[PDB]
């Protein structure tokens, strides 16, 4: 039940929720992701890898849950600020790719997309992992859906 265990659990649950109408279970799962995000939000870590995993869990958690108490947008900016403070120190990894992609989705900071495409270029097109394929798809969807007013007219 460590900070890291909690963060990895939240990353997994937030992913589960996003890759899945208002049933008791649907509400329970959305509520649990909010509850877990709220519990972890006040935690601070000096270790950059632990801090990266905490931030990624929180950004994923608050984006996954339908619930918003009116303070979620403010809390996401606190998390983004924590990510910008460690991004340059993180080594190339799946974690760093996920933080760049989720951070870009919240900011549309072209420097984050640029760095995310450079990380992609380091992988093997002939043998991408299941997670690499998924995060590439997620990044492309954020890039294509920046502006709702640009949606194809039909």
List interacting residues with Ca ion (CB under 5 A): 44
**Shortest spacing between CB 105 and Ca ion, in angstroms:** 8
Give 55 or 119: the residue with its C-beta nearer to Ca ion: 55
Give 84 or 142: the residue with its C-beta nearer to Ca ion: 142
Residues near 105 by beta carbon (within 8 Å), at least 6 away in sequence: 63, 138, 142
**Shortest spacing between CB 127 and Ca ion, in angstroms:** 34
Residue 91 near residue 52, CB atoms below 8 Å = no
Give 62 or 97: the residue with its C-beta nearer to Ca ion: 62
Residue 1 near residue 39, CB atoms below 8 Å = no
Q: CA-CA distance, 33 to 42, in Å (whole number)?
A: 15
Residue with tokens 């996401």: 76
């Amino acid at each position: 039940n460590s900070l890291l265990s909690r963060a990895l659990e939240l990353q997994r649950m937030a992913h589960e929720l996003m890759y899945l109408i208002y049933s008791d279970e649907f509400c329970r799962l959305n509520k649990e992701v909010l509850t877990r995000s709220d519990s972890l939000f006040s935690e601070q870590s000096s270790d950059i890898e632990e801090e990266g995993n905490l931030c990624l869990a929180l950004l994923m958690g608050y984006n996954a849950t339908i619930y918003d108490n009116g303070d979620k947008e403010r809390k996401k900016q606190v998390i983004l600020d924590r990510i910008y403070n460690i991004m340059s120190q993180l080594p190339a990894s799946l974690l760093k790719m996920r933080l760049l992609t989720w951070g870009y989705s919240e900011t549309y900071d072209e420097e984050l997309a640029h760095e995310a495409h450079q990380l992609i270029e380091t992988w093997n097109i002939s043998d991408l992992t299941d997670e690499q394929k998924e995060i590439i798809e997620e990044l492309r969807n954020f890039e294509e859906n920046q502006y709702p007013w640009e949606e194809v007219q039909e």
